[PDB]
């Protein structure tokens with residue numbers, strides 16, 4: 001059987017669903033699980049990660065000791081409540097002494113840690129933190145998250161808006177702040193506190209983040225109210241952490257008193273309050289001290305959680321692998337990840353000459369003989385590492401989307417072959433890629449033709465808008481020519497094409513219809529420029545630089561100055577001032593009719 005573990009390693013997905021799915025074995029212990037997830041992310045500080053299980057509708061928490069066997073941990077807890085309501089989440093619990101410093105030379109771990117701490121901050125105290133503090137914090141998460149954007153970006157109404165109204169400032173700030181200040185002024189406050197963190201890369205952001213939190217949120221330890229002693233039980237707060245070891249403080253803030261270091265800890269033992277109540281009993285034998293250090297915790301659970309803490313630490317301080325808690329092949333651990341009419345038998349396909357390359361698989365020419373009906377020329381997108389299953393599942397995911405579309409300027413899906421290697425069968429656009437097509441025919445195509453193509457493209461992009469489908473890569477490279485008077489739209493699958501991208505795409509990784517329109521502008525230029533690439537001989541940074549300053553692509557010779565202004569309307573920095581697709585359709589329609597009559 002399997003297991004889902006939520007963790008804090010980044011993904012362009014939503015943070016609340018970052019997880020790994022492990023096909024564990026029957027004697028597999030929590031070590032196995034942790035090991036295989038962190039090896040899977042190139043983690044150097046393995047000894048610092050633990051596993052914490054908690055029910056959804058409950059606020060209490062269960063630390064799963066390394067040596068426990070998963071299936072009989074399922075067994076135990078899944079006998080209380082269903083697997084649907086339990087949350088297994090990987091956490092850092094065991095800080096080395098220089099921890100922050102040390103995690104700098106372990107990039108995944110610092111990132112994991114930062115996220116895990118940032119999550120808690122939002123969830124636990126963000127609402128009731130100082131106004132200046134919240135502000136300062138939020139900005140660094142902008143700064144860190146959106147690496148490739150230049151500093152002065154947030155002093156642009158459109159940019160800020162994209163954060164306000166598309167991204168959600170809630171991703172950076174508590175509902176408490178956003179509510180209690182007028183939004184137009186909030187815009188200032190951010191632009192302002194953002195100045196101080198203008199030129200800070202991802203690494204420094206994270207540390208400046210921590211630096212500003214630490215004074216107002218201890219994440220460098222855990223505390224437990226509990227009682228010390230074996231007979232005259234006396235009430236204390238325990239602090240357990242890297243620069244203090246086990247410490248009692250009481251009180252108030254003041255100096256914490258040292259009790260032992262983790263390297264002193266001989267053995268751990270815990271048990272149910274054999275006495276009247278329900279309390280946790282915890283015993284620690286220490287260096288040469290003949291009497292065990294005896295802790296009474298409010299519940300057996302807390303006791304267990306405290307043992308996990310102390311074990312983890314010991315097992316870390318000593319370069320140790322086995323436990324310090326005295327007790328009363330199949331451990332395989334694989335990493336995995338989570339219908340059709342239109343089936344075609346492979347024997348009904350003659351696989352012709354390879355026609356285009358794939359970073360994923362080649363595209364081929366082909367004959368398709370369908371029993372009822374004559375032969376048909378088809379394109380065939382092939383798969384190379386097709387046996388590796390999710391790569392397969394993502395490949396023929398593309399075919400699923402193409403099922404949905406039916407429009408005369410989108411390349412029609414014809415079928416799939418759902419056995420390795422997976423094949424996607426589509427129509428073949430005989431006259432090839434548009435760029436090539438244009439260069440070749442630079443002197444035999446009337447203008448009415450060139451803009452006809454943009455018109456047809458726009459009808460397609462309109463159709464796609466109408467189904468809320470963003471394409472992400474509109475360019476003449478993704479257009480094919482199916483006949484003299486007819487072009488079609490290309491890829492629909494999953495080294496950035498900087499020069500065609502809208503600014504918010506280069507800045508905030510945002511991809512909307514409105515980003516699509518910008519690219520379509522550049523596409524339109526390419527067409528009118530008979531298949532030349534935008535910005536020949538300019539490297540990408542000067543381009544983002546020029547785009548940022550106001551420079552645009554010049555009017556191609558022969559472009560009706562109306563159409564050229566439409567292109568620049570598509571190149572509106574603020575994505576909301578850009579035309580709609582349904583609108584560029586209507587316009588080009590007329591701009592064509594006018595061109596037809598000459």
Ligand SMILES: CN[C@@H]1C[C@H]2O[C@@](C)([C@@H]1OC)n1c3ccccc3c3c4c(c5c6c(n2c5c31)CCCC6)C(=O)NC4
Pocket residue numbers: 355356357358363379381411426427428429430431432433477478479480490491
């Ligand atoms: C960079 N442009 C390539 C031109 C070439 O190969 C590619 C990879 C690319 O076309 C999107 N290609 C596809 C890629 C992904 C899905 C479908 C196609 C595809 C298709 C065709 C095609 C053709 C060419 N290329 C084609 C195609 C070169 C000239 C012959 C026609 C085609 O006719 N139907 C799908």
